[PDB]
Design a binder for these strands. Sequence first.
RNA 1: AUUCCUGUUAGAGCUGUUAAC
DNA 2: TAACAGCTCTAACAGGAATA
Lengths: 456, 252
Amino acid sequence: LSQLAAHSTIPEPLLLFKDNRTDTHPLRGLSQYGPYSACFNLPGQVRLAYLAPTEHMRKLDAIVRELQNPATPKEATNYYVEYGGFEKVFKVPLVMPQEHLRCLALDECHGVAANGNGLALADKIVQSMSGLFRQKHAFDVLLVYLPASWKKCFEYDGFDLHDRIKAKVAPLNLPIQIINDTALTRQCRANVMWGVSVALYAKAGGIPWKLADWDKDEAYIGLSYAIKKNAEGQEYTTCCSQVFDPDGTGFEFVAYDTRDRKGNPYLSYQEMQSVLSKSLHLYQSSHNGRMPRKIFIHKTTHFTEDEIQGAFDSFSSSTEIELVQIIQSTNWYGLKVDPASYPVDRGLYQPLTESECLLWTQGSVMGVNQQNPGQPVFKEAALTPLPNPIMLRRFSGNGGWHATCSSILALTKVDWNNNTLYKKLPVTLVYSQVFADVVKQTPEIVNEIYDYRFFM
Amino acid sequence: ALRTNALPVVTQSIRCGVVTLASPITFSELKERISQKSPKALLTYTVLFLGGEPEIRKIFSNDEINSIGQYYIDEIAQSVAASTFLKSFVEEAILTALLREKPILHRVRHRTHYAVIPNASAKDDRFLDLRKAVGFKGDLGYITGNVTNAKELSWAEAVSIRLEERGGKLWIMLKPEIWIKPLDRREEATDFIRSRRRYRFNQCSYQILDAWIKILFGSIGGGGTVNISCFPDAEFKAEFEIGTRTAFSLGV
RNA sequence: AUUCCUGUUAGAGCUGUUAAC
DNA sequence: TAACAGCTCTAACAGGAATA
Ligand SMILES: [Mg+2]
């Protein structure tokens, strides 16, 4: 009477690296083979530029030196492999800035930071990049260091310094990696070196890794919303993030606002179909004008019937539409029994109803462990002892949870901003939420689309 | 295999009591009168009640009571899916039936029900399994105590019990938690709960869930559908039957 | 903000069910 | 439109580092 439907397990998504080498473990595969974009020359080199207060430029120099030189994992040695330096790992030089590519933040930055005005702090920080705007050919990624003295402007009610800076520097087409004292201070140095190096390569060129065996005829849409607290009511900022592997070798990962105002996360008919009209045009431009054969729309909340009508009217009958709601907080949780020492395997999904499934995007991963191979790795072990599944609710389902579960799971391992093994959420939802935060911070970003490297 | 935290509720229909009122009533009015009178009955407005007629007569005077008949919720799963009031009512009824004949404390945090180990009755025989499950390296642990670096804060092992409507089925969701005796000061036990829960991995959590099922149903989940009942000495009572084994599945 | 996502604290939105206005 | 209920989300912090 308690026996549910038989569960299934989606194998750990293989990651494509240099010259079609597949490895589930990102850092291990990166060290062994090199980035997927190392077969060709997306970056011929990774040139950095420095933007930091004149007292803190030694910190940027030091972290760049640690990027150059090898580092050994201290924490989470269960998973993290040895770091061999930027040149050795990425097969690409990490070019230190010249004096002309090393610009100091003005003292007005410090003044407005002590004044606690992040709105002017972001303006002054982007103004400090004025010399770098003319030299955009000389450097690839600007290294911005935010000292703890600016802590008063990092985050407060209605403002986000990171999102504001990345919004101001997105139309300028110069990628930025922001460094706080967190990266300098965290005791495990292989952690920070791996994360920063992968981020720098991804936004100084791109594609540290891709997904192995990924269909190019699919588009993945994730709609995520942010809330801006009005003095009278509230405003909802729903943004749409698309992922797809286009005909070109460059994996495509973009975001764009679904839009005047919204009072709930639920798109109207002419809003949902407008954003999907934008979406399949974006897919078509990267697919020589071919229509998607399958659309995966991921949402944090449920699809209204008007939303379903808009989705089904935005695409022809040839296109197969998958509307899926992702419920992060569920009552269900699972134990592995044979009780195993390690929890339920990652990729395990249990169908609840016809339209409901529990996907374990968190769990034990095998064949990724560095020390004592044969022992599973539970990435959130420090956080929780057992993984919390997510719930998938299908609003247009022909049958078969394997396709959507594999899509969602594979979509957890291409967050190049994520230093750990995976994410509990698909990158569609992750980047739609990040871009929703960015748009809610700065409204005037609605017209253009933006690639992940400008906001990761 | 995969063992969940969901115990099936095979009960399909429950009998309730209807009190027809001479004047319209609001659910807020009913719930505040509940708090004021503190009856030995469960009440919802849809006015449905489970328990004894005398308590309902205490709650509503004879002037405002027209008749008291019986309600038949034929499809409990469909009715609680349709009505959040029915969902809350049935969840509270199952909780009252569960924690009736047992020393387990009944607490509520936010709107989730918890079966909490009593500090006074911690050393009971029925709690030895929980002591073993939370013990270290095969010794006997503790399931109640004082927070290590807190002035007055207390802690106990609890299980959150939720009602879940999934398709046409009802589930009792059990989540082992650490209840903090002052609810509004539970944030002050963040580090204590974190350190206590840190190494409750798959094995320890399986043992803890087995111990909590044994505590809440007197028997391990083998061939059992123990029938719990709320207000057995009342005209309008609810008798639920819950499978003692949690929901589980083998892969294909 | 190299990261992760866990807790805490609140809130909002969706649905309903009543009472209505 | 005003409560009520449940479900599920974001927002804002704090917080520690992968079977001990
Ligand atoms: Mg980044």
